[PDB]
DNA sequence: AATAAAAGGAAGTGGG
DNA sequence: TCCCACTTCCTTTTA
């Protein structure tokens, strides 16, 4: 199955949920979720995965934080903002 | 208080 | 066996 970081990168490239997520600085790989519309994006992630429970933004961000150690996605010190690694952006 | 973002330990689930 | 890549649950902290 698709990995969470790839699902988010794919959405940013397609623009299909432009009111839920957007690039802040695409050259740096920084992106930001919508305060009011992030839950719809989280719901889509859970459905794509076929998870038993409804996915929430809180649970999706819990998964996002696990990428901090390996580097694929890191939290930025700005509201609802994260950053992909150069490796993820290049791949 | 009400609301929200951010955090992570711990245990459960999937598919190797 | 036992790690993958999350998911689920619960609690805490800060603004």
From Swiss-Prot:
Induction and repression of expression: Highly expressed in both FV-P and FV-A-induced erythro-leukemia cell lines that have undergone rearrangements of the SPI1 gene due to the insertion of SFFV. Negatively regulated by microRNA-155 (miR-155).
Pathology noted in the entry: Agammaglobulinemia 10, autosomal dominant: A form of agammaglobulinemia, a primary immunodeficiency characterized by profoundly low or absent serum antibodies and low or absent circulating B-cells due to an early block of B-cell development. Affected individuals develop severe infections in the first years of life.
Function noted in UniProt: Pioneer transcription factor, which controls hematopoietic cell fate by decompacting stem cell heterochromatin and allowing other transcription factors to enter otherwise inaccessible genomic sites. Once in open chromatin, can directly control gene expression by binding genetic regulatory elements and can also more broadly influence transcription by recruiting transcription factors, such as interferon regulatory factors (IRFs), to otherwise inaccessible genomic regions. Transcriptionally activates genes important for myeloid and lymphoid lineages, such as CSF1R.
Family: Belongs to the ETS family.
Main localisation: nucleus
An example Gene Ontology biological process: positive regulation of B cell differentiation
GO molecular function per UniProt: chromatin binding; cis-regulatory region sequence-specific DNA binding; DNA-binding transcription activator activity; DNA-binding transcription activator activity, RNA polymerase II-specific; DNA-binding transcription factor activity; DNA-binding transcription factor activity, RNA polymerase II-specific; DNA-binding transcription factor binding; DNA-binding transcription repressor activity
DNA-binding region location: 2-85
Annotated tissue distribution: In the bone marrow, concentrated in hematopoietic stem cell, lymphoid progenitor, myeloid lineage (granulocyte macrophage progenitors, classical dendritic cells, monocytes) and B-cell clusters. Among B-cells, predominantly expressed in pre-B1 cells. Expressed in germinal center B-cells.
Gene: SPI1
Oligomeric form and interacting partners: Binds DNA as a monomer. Can form homomers. Directly interacts with CEBPD/NF-IL6-beta; this interaction does not affect DNA-binding properties of each partner. Interacts with NONO/p54(nrb). Interacts with RUNX1/AML1. Interacts with GFI1; the interaction represses SPI1 transcriptional activity, hence blocks SPI1-induced macrophage differentiation of myeloid progenitor cells. Interacts with CEBPE. Interacts with IRF4/Pip and IRF8. Interacts with JUN. Interacts with RB1. Interacts with TBP.
Organism: Homo sapiens
Protein name: Transcription factor PU.1
GO cellular component terms listed in the entry, alphabetical order: chromatin; nucleoplasm; nucleus; transcription regulator complex
Key words, A-Z: Activator, Developmental protein, Disease variant, DNA-binding, Nucleus, Phosphoprotein, Proto-oncogene, RNA-binding, Transcription, Transcription regulation
Subcellular location(s) per record: Nucleus
Binding residue positions for DNA: 49, 62, 65, 75
């Amino acid at each position: 199955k698709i990995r969470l970081y790839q699902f988010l990168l794919d959405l940013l490239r397609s623009g299909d949920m432009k009111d839920s997520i957007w690039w802040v600085d695409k050259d740096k790989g920084t992106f930001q979720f919508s305060s009011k519309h992030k839950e719809a994006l989280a719901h889509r992630w859970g459905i794509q995965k076929g998870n038993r429970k409804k996915m929430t933004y809180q649970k999706m961000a819990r998964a996002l934080r696990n990428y901090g150690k390996t580097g694929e996605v890191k939290k930025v010190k700005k509201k609802l903002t994260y950053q992909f690694s150069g490796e993820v952006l290049g791949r």
